[PDB]
Amino acid sequence: RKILIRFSDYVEVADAQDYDRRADKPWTRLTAADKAAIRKELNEFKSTEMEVHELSRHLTRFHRP
Amino acid sequence: SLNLDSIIGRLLEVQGSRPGKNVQLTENEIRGLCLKSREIFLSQPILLELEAPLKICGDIHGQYYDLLRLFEYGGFPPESNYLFLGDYVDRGKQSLETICLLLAYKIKYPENFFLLRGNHECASINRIYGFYDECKRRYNIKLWKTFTDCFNCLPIAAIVDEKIFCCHGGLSPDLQSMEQIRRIMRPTDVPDQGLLCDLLWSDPDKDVQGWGENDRGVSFTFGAEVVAKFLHKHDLDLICRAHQVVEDGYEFFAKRQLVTLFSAPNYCGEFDNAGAMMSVDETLMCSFQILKPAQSASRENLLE
Ligand SMILES: [Mn+2]
Ligand SMILES: [Mn+2]
């Protein structure tokens, strides 16, 4: 089969910004009760507020409470 | 009214400021960016058909300062055309500025600037990996719900010049025809399994023959023979995807039949990776531009 794309043999490199990229990790700070409350919050949001096309309602992702 | 030029100017002006400087958009401005971009997404196909020249970028994860650096190197829109592969928010310091600039550029240059959906552009993931909390800190939960409506309308994949298939994650055992992508209706959530899940979640694995289990707890891995068979069936030359940190910002798989792009250098200050973008010229020559300085993969089921 005939291939159309090709790749350059030389990459350009430049220096990235030098700054502190560390960010908060809130997903490591969830108690069991917090997780239950979030599952409930997501389920209620998706069942009462979030618009989904009829033909895609079978894709909406619910969590076991 | 959306004063789009004012929003863009204010987002770009921090380029000369200390790293991490926030941009003071109003709630109504951000809601306008979400509503107008959503309308544009819905007016364009869910499977984008794009033409080179194009610059293709992988995950950004709220590294706004790095996004500005990437645009400085590649050319600020509309000097170059862009396709981003998803994962704009979460797991970084400035998801809001990042997504706001991307949405503003989509509205300003709707035929020259393109955003695909990543697995972090859905409620169940960005509820917990940082974006909801960032929205709550700076604005309110209702604004997070407005972003969710916009993300639910993003396109899912793109084909560049009938030869490069682009998506965030990867291939799917359910993907037999491109029509199956085109039949997905928006707005939609990302399911826990099936075609749309796999397009946003799957990964290549050199040690897998065929399809395998994915240790993220969702979707699949796929081997080099799956890539080769897919490209042959669809008369494609390359799969271009993102979704994994790679040391050089780009990494080939399956004798250069697949490439992974990752555009957030020094990811979340914990990894020593570069960030890259792939430029495709009008003759379909692909080249890389790099910005060089596990625990990194997101997972499903953290709530369960
Ligand atoms: Mn990512
Ligand atoms: Mn991802």
Author numbering:
A (entry chain C): 516 to 580
B (entry chain A): 6 to 298, 325 to 335
What are the paper's exact sentences on this?
The three Protein Phosphatase 1 (PP1) isoforms regulate diverse cellular processes, acting in partnership with over 200 different PP1-interacting proteins (PIPs). The four Phosphatase and actin regulator (Phactr) proteins are novel PIPs that are implicated in cytoskeletal regulation in animal models and cell culture settings. Here, we show that Phactr1 confers sequence-specificity on the Phactr1/PP1 holoenzyme. We show that efficient catalysis requires interactions between conserved hydrophobic residues in the substrate and a novel Phactr1-PP1 composite surface, which comprises a hydrophobic pocket and associated amphipathic cavity with a surrounding basic rim.
Fusion proteins comprising PP1(7–304) joined via a (SG)9 linker to unphosphorylated substrate sequences were coexpressed with Phactr1(516-580) for structural analysis. This approach allowed determination of the structures of the IRSp53(449-465) and spectrin αII (1025–1039) complexes at 1.09 Å and 1.30 Å resolution, respectively (referred to hereafter as the IRSp53 and spectrin complexes), but was unsuccessful with Tbc1d15, Plekho2, afadin, and cofilin. The Phactr1/PP1-IRSp53 and Phactr1/PP1-spectrin complexes crystallised in the same spacegroup. The substrate sequences, whose N-termini are largely unresolved, make extensive contacts across the PP1 catalytic site, then extend in a sinuous trajectory across the composite Phactr1/PP1 surface, making numerous hydrophobic and ionic contacts. Like the Phactr1/PP1 holoenzyme, the complexes contain a presumed phosphate anion at the catalytic site, and thus appear to represent putative enzyme/product complexes (see below). IRSp53 and spectrin make virtually identical contacts with the PP1 catalytic cleft, predominantly via their mainchains. In both structures, the residues +3 to +6 form a β-turn, allowing the hydrophobic doublet L459-L460IRSp53/L1035-L1036spectrin (+4/+5) to make intimate contact with the Phactr1/PP1 hydrophobic pocket, entirely burying the +5 leucine sidechain. These interactions are stabilised by hydrogen bonds between the mainchain carbonyls of substrate residues +2, +4, +5 and Phactr1 R576 K550, and R554, and between the sidechain of the substrate acidic +6 residue (D461IRSp53/E1037spectrin) and Phactr1 H578; a hydrogen bond between the D461IRSp53 mainchain carbonyl and Phactr1 R579 is substituted by a hydrogen bond between the E1037spectrin carboxylate and Phactr1 R579 mainchain amide. At position +2 (G457IRSp53/E1033spectrin), the mainchain amide and carbonyl make hydrogen bonds with the mainchain carbonyls of PP1 R221 and Phactr1 R576 respectively; in addition, the E1033spectrin side chain spans the top of the amphipathic cavity to make an additional salt bridge with the Phactr1 R576 side chain. The most striking aspect of substrate recognition is the role played by the composite surface generated by the close apposition of the Phactr1 extreme C-terminal sequences and the PP1 hydrophobic groove.
